[PDB]
């Protein structure tokens, strides 16, 4: 659930807009949170996806899809060869996993015009650039 | 009377020689380095401490292995031996 701000119980040093503790919520889904934790222990297997089985009160049940890139079955067999590429190292933290892609919010079009043009950081940078052409 | 006298009772080394960096900054009581986070995986290289990274960086040391990697790249990491096109007989 709610990712209650790690506040000292001292009141959060500033403006009243920042004073919420317990109603402050992950910009990352619980699907992704499940994946990132597994991925640090299992750094040798590369995570494609996560799907849900069941949920009661305190916990949500996921099965996480793990691939062996160092097993020559998975080097072997052409469709999944590209996952062995070093570009896919911990997808989970970069949200190239389905869980992470949704939290970063990359949909074509308009409902996401800001942020689809740039991934979520990138869009900001383009906009706030004075593109100074030489021959002004 | 703790004025210069406060200096006068200073005999107990709070920091000893860093196993990681020798910078003599490891807290006996906390068993932890200021700067170099003493055997807790991470060296604490802060981006607020631009200067700290500057001290800790490549180039402050001899960079022994990694320098050789650079030249071998240009060679396209070949195991073999070039040898000698012409004679060249060693006899006395």
């Amino acid at each position: 659930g709610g990712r209650k701000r790690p506040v000292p119980k001292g009141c959060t040093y500033g403006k009243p807009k920042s004073h919420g503790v317990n109603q402050l919520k992950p910009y990352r889904g619980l699907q992704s949170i499940a994946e990132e934790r597994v991925g640090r222990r299992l750094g040798g297997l590369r995570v494609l996806n996560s799907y849900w089985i069941a949920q009661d009160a305190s916990y949500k049940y996921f099965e996480v899809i793990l691939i062996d890139t160092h097993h020559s079955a998975i080097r072997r067999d052409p469709k999944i060869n590209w996952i062995c590429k070093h570009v896919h190292k911990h997808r989970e933290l970069r949200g190239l996993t389905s869980a992470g892609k949704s939290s970063r919010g990359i949909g074509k079009g308009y409902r996401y015009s800001q942020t689809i043009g740039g991934s979520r950081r990138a869009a900001w940078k383009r906009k706030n650039r004075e593109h100074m052409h030489r021959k002004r | 009377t703790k004025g210069t006298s406060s200096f006068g009772k200073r005999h107990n080394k709070t920091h000893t020689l860093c196993r990681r960096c020798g910078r003599s900054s490891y807290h006996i009581q906390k068993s932890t380095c200021a700067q170099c986070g003493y055997p807790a995986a991470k060296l604490r290289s802060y981006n607020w401490s631009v200067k700290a990274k500057r001290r800790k960086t490549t180039g402050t040391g001899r960079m022994q292995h990694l320098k050789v990697v650079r030249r071998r790249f240009r060679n396209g990491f070949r195991e073999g031996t070039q040898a000698k096109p012409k004679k060249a007989v060693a006899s006395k």
């Binding site: 160092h70 020559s72 080097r75 072997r76 067999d77 052409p78 469709k79 060869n81 062995c84 590429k85 070093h86 | 990697v69 071998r72 990491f77 195991e79």
Partner: protein
């Protein structure tokens, strides 16, 4: 060097040679998919390419 070559000729013909005979290249390069296992194409992609390989033609006047 005579030990080194003695070891090389024994480990020659033998798979999984000792770590120091293994081409110390770079860590990334070693694990980066052998050339055989990059060229691997699905049976269907072989059909697609087999009939239709991009042929060296021309345009125009």
């Amino acid at each position: 060097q005579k030990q080194k070559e003695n070891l090389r000729k024994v480990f020659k013909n033998k798979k999984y040679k000792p770590l120091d005979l293994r081409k110390k290249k770079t860590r990334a390069i070693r694990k980066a998919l052998s050339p055989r296992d990059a060229n691997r194409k699905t049976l269907k992609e072989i059909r697609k390419r087999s009939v239709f390989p991009q042929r060296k033609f021309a345009v125009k006047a």
